[PDB]
Design a binder for these strands. Sequence first.
RNA 1: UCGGAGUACAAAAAACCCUCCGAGUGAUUUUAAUCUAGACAAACCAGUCAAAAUAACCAUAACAUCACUUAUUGAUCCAAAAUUUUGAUCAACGGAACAAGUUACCCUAGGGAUAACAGCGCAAUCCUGUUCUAGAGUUCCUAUCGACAAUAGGGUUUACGACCU
RNA 2: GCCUAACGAGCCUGGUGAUAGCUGGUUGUCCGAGAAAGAAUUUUAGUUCAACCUUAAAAAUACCCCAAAAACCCUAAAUUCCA
Lengths: 47, 52, 354, 110, 38, 21, 95, 100
Amino acid sequence: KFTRSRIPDKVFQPSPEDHEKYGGDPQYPHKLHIVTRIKSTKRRPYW
Amino acid sequence: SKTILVKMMSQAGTGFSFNTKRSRLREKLTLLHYDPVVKKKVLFVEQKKIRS
Amino acid sequence: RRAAPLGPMPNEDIDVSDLERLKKYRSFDRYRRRAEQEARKPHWWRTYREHFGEESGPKDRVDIGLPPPKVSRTQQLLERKQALRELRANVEEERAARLQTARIPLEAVRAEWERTCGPYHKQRLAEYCGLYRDLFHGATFVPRVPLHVAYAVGEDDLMPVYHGNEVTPTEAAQAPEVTYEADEGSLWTLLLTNLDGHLLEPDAEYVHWLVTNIPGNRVTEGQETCPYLPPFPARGSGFHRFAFLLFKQDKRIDFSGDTRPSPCYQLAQRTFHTFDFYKKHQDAMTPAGLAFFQCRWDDSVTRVFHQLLDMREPVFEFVRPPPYHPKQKRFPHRQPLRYLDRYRDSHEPTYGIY
Amino acid sequence: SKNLGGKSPGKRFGIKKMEGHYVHAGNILATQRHFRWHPGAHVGLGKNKCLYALEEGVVRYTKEVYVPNPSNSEAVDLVTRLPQGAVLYKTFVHVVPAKPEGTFKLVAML
Amino acid sequence: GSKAVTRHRRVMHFERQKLMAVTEYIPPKPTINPRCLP
Amino acid sequence: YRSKPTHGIGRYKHLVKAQVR
Amino acid sequence: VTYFSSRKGKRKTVKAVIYRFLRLHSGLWLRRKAGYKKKLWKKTAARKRRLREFVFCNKTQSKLLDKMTTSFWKRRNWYADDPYQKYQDRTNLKV
Amino acid sequence: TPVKAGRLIVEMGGRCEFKEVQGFLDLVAHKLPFPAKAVSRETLEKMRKDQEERERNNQNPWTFERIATANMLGIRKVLSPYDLTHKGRYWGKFYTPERV
RNA sequence: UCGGAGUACAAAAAACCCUCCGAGUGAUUUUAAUCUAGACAAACCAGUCAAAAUAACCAUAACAUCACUUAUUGAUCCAAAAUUUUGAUCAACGGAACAAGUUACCCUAGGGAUAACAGCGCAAUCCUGUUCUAGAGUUCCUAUCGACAAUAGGGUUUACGACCU
RNA sequence: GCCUAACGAGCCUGGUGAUAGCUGGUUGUCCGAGAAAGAAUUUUAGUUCAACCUUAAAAAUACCCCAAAAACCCUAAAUUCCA
Ligand SMILES: Nc1nc2c(ncn2[C@@H]2O[C@H](COP(=O)(O)O)[C@@H](O)[C@H]2O)c(=O)[nH]1
Ligand SMILES: [Mg+2]
Ligand SMILES: [Mg+2]
Ligand SMILES: [Mg+2]
Ligand SMILES: [Mg+2]
Ligand SMILES: [Mg+2]
Ligand SMILES: [Mg+2]
Ligand SMILES: [Mg+2]
Ligand SMILES: [Mg+2]
Ligand SMILES: [Mg+2]
Ligand SMILES: [Mg+2]
Ligand SMILES: [Mg+2]
Ligand SMILES: [Mg+2]
Ligand SMILES: [Mg+2]
Ligand SMILES: [Mg+2]
Ligand SMILES: [Mg+2]
Ligand SMILES: [Mg+2]
Ligand SMILES: [Mg+2]
Ligand SMILES: [Mg+2]
Ligand SMILES: [Mg+2]
Ligand SMILES: [Mg+2]
Ligand SMILES: [Mg+2]
Ligand SMILES: [Mg+2]
Ligand SMILES: [Mg+2]
Ligand SMILES: [Mg+2]
Ligand SMILES: [Mg+2]
Ligand SMILES: [Mg+2]
Ligand SMILES: [Mg+2]
Ligand SMILES: [Mg+2]
């Protein structure tokens, strides 16, 4: 059965090199997201 | 072994008939039931035989 | 998916292997004792004690009371031991214990109870009945001194008032007597208050009696602050609680703001806050005595309402909430014919245009 | 063939109301085949082992101890065979009351 | 429709084949060969 | 329930068994 | 159902509707539970009461009965000593 | 009898070396249905720690564990729920030790 | 036709000419009432529980029990009872009140929704190759074979599928 | 077998516009939203319902949903219900 996928919390623990790689601030998180859809919702589940 | 269905009639004078399964090889049955028209504990006897 | 427990399992302490070597209880009473011991521990999972009103659970009780009496433990133990040995020394005690015929002097048992553990028992009755909650909130006291209230019905009839008792206002129409043991070196304050029965304010209480600066035992010789008033509950709402409080005060304190006049039938004047009143004079008074009784409505309440306070007597009623009904459907499916009677307004045939 | 009568629909036994759901008196909280959830406070028991709310309020699910009826011989025998450190734990369904029992209203002043 | 475990190697979906191909093992390759190093 | 930390709180059959050289 | 009769050209009704159904003026249809006269000795008292109870009809059944019923039976009726006269009208319906 | 990957079938002991034992056990292991090897304790630990050093000396940042557990590019629509445990090294009854 | 377990591993649901147990009732007395909130479940018909309120009895006395308890059962109409009840291997078990064979003398409406022929999918069966030496061959695995096993390929036979007609 | 070129029972007329769950056909333009199966059934070539969907009309909460919660020997991906 294909169902929804649980995502473990270990994935979103950032390494100290990730801030240097992606230009993020290790102290202050940013305030607002720019979100832009790339792919299509076709061939993807209804949720 | 088979059972018989017997109709029981009230001894309180009021007409009330209720059916009871009873074993065939046993004797005539006499029970203590409740009559909803007399609201008392009424002795009932086996009167007729209906169903095998 | 499996998660980790937050703390110990209940049965993980005992060993699964070698079941024959582990001792068993063979008594259902032993299980009853063990289970009632186990149910009182604060487990980390959701419990009945968490959900069904344990009244904040652990509470830091502020104690506003007299010091406990300092009694020498070793001397007390040895005199109790010697009294017990002289009690088992007798043979007639063995005879009365064996032949199922022995009586105890319950009056002497009551006296030693009043001296020994009566304070702690009256404290737990006051905690159960919520005397501390509606007078001093989280604060509590041990009723150290013995205290006796009695109402004189006639020549010989004398109706006592103990902790949590039930006295009809016909007995309590007149002023009571108060008995307690004290030497002439201290000052006392007696205050009878009705905790529930205030009409306008739910958080306030009535004064029914108040006498201050009592020299020793003698209540009558003390200065009279507020007059005695007979108990007046409502006809509908019964069982109002009336509490006698006794405070020990060091200095002689006079009140100019708490003084009440001679007839004083105005319930606007008879409005009390025992919390704020003890806040006013915390440094002088310490509560030592307490005795409270329940009181319901009788025919003698009517004269107190009409003749004394000039009242039309209010009558209340215990009204339950109306029964729940769902939202009415246009087409009910598999429902009795009486389903319309649940939502019918009145049992009267109404004709709109006919 | 050799195996017959394997066709039978489900009896829909299961849990109906969760923790936090508001129920009234008479609502069936759960139905069960064997004793899976036991009735607790303000939860009745029908003869088909269904659990129904006795008072109007909020449903809770709780773990407590099992002290069975002494007239139940198999249960008290299971109690007798337990070792001394062991206590039985089961789950229970409760309804905390929301509405009070009643109120006092002034109907007539005389 | 075939079973989950067969004997005919169970030829894969193309996205899973791309997954296998991108996640093949690659060895560490040093900058200078240690044999003809000193 | 399986996923809860309170799983197996009702386990009793491992404590009572009911089924020489 | 004869939608157009051969004698009068009107819409007939089915008497099997009338012989076991009752129509209230709110559109609700009343009926008996099935099997209330069959095998009373075998069934429990609660089941006997449940079969002795009157029941209502839902939307699809009520519309089927209204379609198979002519307009004579949908009239307003004022019988003397009618037990269903109290049940004819609907009240407190917030839809 | 069902046999999974990594299950020992016949275990031999004695006072002699591995070489002749491997020499006559390769003929046994060849004729089995699944692929099989004649292994010793040292050889088994050698290939196990070889698998570990290959896994920790992965050069590419992208691996089956990181993709499948975090659900990268919606790969769980194609992958099996068993593949979270199998980590791509097992597909059906076939196990490839070069997979990492 | 109905029930129990797995299939269907954790709320429910969930099929097969899938794998296994059963049911078409016995035993006993505790002979098990009336009314009515609110619910489960369900296309409909059916099925299940049920607090409060009356009456019976300790004078504030409503679960019939056991056999895995779950299944132990049948709708209208119609017949007999007569004051309130009953009647079906209607077992094809949502049930036509009562009806069999054969047609190569056959007919019509259709179907590749469905078989025989061929084609196609698969290679159980069939046919080819190789891996392995226990053993035959007076010694001697491989001159000629080669048991127990492995692996790959072909689409000649009989199937299996029912995809084009 | 033969009974006026078709005989398991002639031909013509009438009933007759016989009835077909079966096959075929169904005639102008443009726009809006738009459906793949749970239950019974002499029933699986069809019907009658439920779930979906269309046109209007009332309302107010709808999906996503952190905790907390949902069984007893062992049990994965995960489900229910909720701010
Ligand atoms: N016994 C019985 N017969 C019924 C029932 N309903 C219809 N019948 C029909 O009534 C007739 C009884 O006559 P019999 O065949 O017994 O002489 C039969 O045609 C039977 O099919 C019923 O409920 N019970
Ligand atoms: Mg001591
Ligand atoms: Mg089943
Ligand atoms: Mg089924
Ligand atoms: Mg498939
Ligand atoms: Mg091999
Ligand atoms: Mg529902
Ligand atoms: Mg009751
Ligand atoms: Mg049939
Ligand atoms: Mg049928
Ligand atoms: Mg059915
Ligand atoms: Mg012939
Ligand atoms: Mg033809
Ligand atoms: Mg075909
Ligand atoms: Mg088809
Ligand atoms: Mg086709
Ligand atoms: Mg041909
Ligand atoms: Mg063919
Ligand atoms: Mg062809
Ligand atoms: Mg084939
Ligand atoms: Mg091939
Ligand atoms: Mg030889
Ligand atoms: Mg001719
Ligand atoms: Mg036609
Ligand atoms: Mg058809
Ligand atoms: Mg469009
Ligand atoms: Mg429809
Ligand atoms: Mg959650
Ligand atoms: Mg919500």
